[PDB]
Design a protein around this ligand. Structure first.
Ligand SMILES: Nc1ncnc2c1ncn2[C@@H]1O[C@H](CSCC[C@H](N)C(=O)O)[C@@H](O)[C@H]1O
Length: 351
């Protein structure tokens, strides 16, 4: 179609058609069926927790966790729980599945039975999910690998055809997306751009990232960046970057227009914003991330069921914050059971 983004030809189909190693293929069932199941195991635990809270006359600690509780209650009371009646599992069937689901079934086995403990404050959700780096592997899991691959693939296209590209990654964390990007853009550790600014809210990640990304360490710079705050005030050079990568982070901010405006301050006009985001809430994500305070960062501006936005919503937000909107959307899967995407947008001069 000759569609271009950031000056290179790319299409949704070009990215979405890529098939990559995923545990669901290897386990191996179809994504839509598994999505039914990975989410299927969660529905059981959600239902149990809601039933247990109510029967025991318990209420959650009076903080963000009540929002989590509300979502689980609605999931059950809306009748959505029963529909998920359609899939019945004996307690034998349930555990038998989970052993096969690698990272995902495993978070369910970890977190599912701890829902009441988290709600009532007997279990520290973050510490709990982080043990054995389970949270970090969740990012590496099949759940988000395809969207990360979309991003890496676009970065490769960009860096292979254009030289001296400057990249900044927001919320790089332990480098799950980064690792995919670097592996495609610099398969042999060769220099491939003029700058890769590795950033996160917390510098605590940087040490492990350097080790994880050792093959590329001399090409990476590391700096703290709270994207909720003015980037210039944080020692960054405004409007110098050609590509910004933000995987699974932008939603975790308090006010999306403020965050996007800050992203804009970093990009050159014509610069590309690579946004990797979940497209919608699923019970599994509610279970997995809903227990964490960061999930509820947007409640004050109405993101009260989850921090997430649909692609259409991101499109509008982008247009209001100096971007072109969604130039390209690539989804992990086709149909209703899709849950993640890459959104590419172009920074526009406000002048
Ligand atoms: N306000 C903020 N500014 C910059 N980073 C933030 C942030 N709030 C949360 N983050 C970071 O965003 C990351 C989200 S987890 C995503 C990790 C990685 N991008 C991946 O996809 O695999 C965390 O490391 C967290 O520290």
């Amino acid at each position: 179609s000759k569609q271009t983004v950031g000056g290179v030809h790319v299409t949704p189909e070009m990215l979405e058609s890529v098939q990559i190693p995923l545990e669901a293929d290897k386990v191996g069932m179809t994504p839509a069926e598994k999505s039914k199941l990975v989410n299927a195991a969660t529905a059981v635990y959600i239902d149990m927790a809601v039933e247990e809270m109510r029967s025991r006359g318990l209420a959650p600690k009076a903080d963000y966790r009540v929002h989590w509780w509300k979502v689980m209650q609605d999931f059950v009371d809306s009748g959505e729980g029963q529909r998920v009646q359609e899939t019945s599992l004996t307690n034998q069937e349930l555990e038998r599945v989970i052993a096969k689901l690698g990272i995902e079934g495993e978070v369910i086995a970890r977190m599912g039975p701890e829902i009441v403990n988290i709600l009532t404050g007997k279990t520290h959700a973050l510490a709990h999910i982080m043990r054995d780096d389970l949270l970090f592997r969740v990012y590496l899991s099949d759940e988000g690998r395809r969207a990360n691959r979309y991003m890496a693939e676009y970065a490769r296209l960009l860096t292979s055809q254009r030289r001296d590209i400057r990249i900044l990654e927001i919320g790089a964390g332990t480098g799950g997306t980064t690792s995919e990007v670097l592996n495609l853009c610099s398969p042999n550790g060769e220099s491939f751009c003029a700058e890769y600014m590795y950033t996160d809210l917390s510098p605590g990640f940087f040490n492990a990232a350097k080790t994880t990304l050792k093959k590329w360490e001399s090409h990476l710079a590391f700096q703290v960046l709270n994207i909720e705050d003015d980037p210039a005030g944080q020692g960054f050079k405004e409007h110098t970057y050609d590509l910004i990568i933000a995987a699974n982070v932008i939603h975790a901010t308090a006010r999306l227009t403020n965050t996007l405006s800050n992203v804009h301050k970093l990009l050159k006009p014509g610069g590309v914003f690579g946004l990797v985001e979940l497209t919608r809430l699923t019970p599994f994500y509610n279970l997995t991330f809903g227990s964490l305070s960061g999930w509820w960062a947007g409640v004050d501006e109405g993101r009260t069921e989850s921090p997430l936005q649909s692609p259409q919503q991101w499109n509008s937000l982008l247009k209001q914050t100096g971007f072109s909107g969604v130039d390209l959307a690539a989804y992990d899967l086709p149909g209703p059971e899709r849950h993640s995407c890459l959104l590419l947008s172009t920074a526009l001069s406000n002048s």
